[PDB]
């Protein structure tokens, strides 16, 4: 299943994920693809920051659903 991750500059990337994948799994895929360490990633869906330990299925993220990535410095 592919999902979309959009950033604030508008670059959208595409990931292959499983509904059972955790949010930290997804952040690790973003690291693998784009070099950004997971602790610098905020992922947002339905206006909510996604919690590392829960799954895409927990948030009802479907095929071709879009997430929002906001980079952050650790604080």
From Swiss-Prot:
Annotated consequence of substituting residue 72 to G: No effect on ADP-ribosylation
Cross-linked residues, Glycyl lysine isopeptide (Lys-Gly) (interchain with G-Cter in ubiquitin): 6, 11, 27, 29, 33, 48, 63
Ubiquitin-like domain segment(s): 1-75
Interacts with activating enzyme (site feature) positions: 54, 72
Phenotype when changing residue 65 to A: Prevents phosphorylation in case of mitophagy. Decreased localization of PRKN to mitochondria
Modified-residue entries ((Microbial infection) ADP-ribosylthreonine), positions: 66
Signal peptide: none
Effect the entry attributes to changing residue 74 to K: No effect on ADP-ribosylation
Phosphoserine PTM sites in chain numbering: 65
Residue(s) at site: Essential for function: 68
Effect of residue 74 to G: No effect on ADP-ribosylation
Post-translational changes noted in the entry: Phosphorylated at Ser-65 by PINK1 during mitophagy. Phosphorylated ubiquitin specifically binds and activates parkin (PRKN), triggering mitophagy. Phosphorylation does not affect E1-mediated E2 charging of ubiquitin but affects discharging of E2 enzymes to form polyubiquitin chains. It also affects deubiquitination by deubiquitinase enzymes such as USP30. Mono-ADP-ribosylated at the C-terminus by PARP9, a component of the PPAR9-DTX3L complex. ADP-ribosylation requires processing by E1 and E2 enzymes and prevents ubiquitin conjugation to substrates such as histones.
Domain of life: Eukaryota
Disulfide bond residue pairs: none
Compartments where located: Cytoplasm; Nucleus; Mitochondrion outer membrane
Bilayer topology: Peripheral membrane protein
Its job: Exists either covalently attached to another protein, or free (unanchored). When covalently bound, it is conjugated to target proteins via an isopeptide bond either as a monomer (monoubiquitin), a polymer linked via different Lys residues of the ubiquitin (polyubiquitin chains) or a linear polymer linked via the initiator Met of the ubiquitin (linear polyubiquitin chains).
UniProt protein name: Ubiquitin
Species this chain originates from: Homo sapiens
Residues of the full protein shown: 1 to 75 of 229
């Amino acid at each position: 299943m592919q999902i979309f991750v959009k950033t604030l500059t508008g670059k959208t990337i595409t990931l292959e994920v499983e509904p059972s994948d955790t949010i930290e799994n997804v952040k690790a895929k973003i690291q693998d693809k784009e070099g950004i360490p997971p602790d610098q990633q905020r992922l947002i869906f339905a206006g909510k920051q996604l919690e590392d330990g829960r799954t895409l299925s927990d948030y009802n993220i479907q095929k071709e659903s879009t997430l929002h990535l906001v980079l952050r410095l650790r604080g």
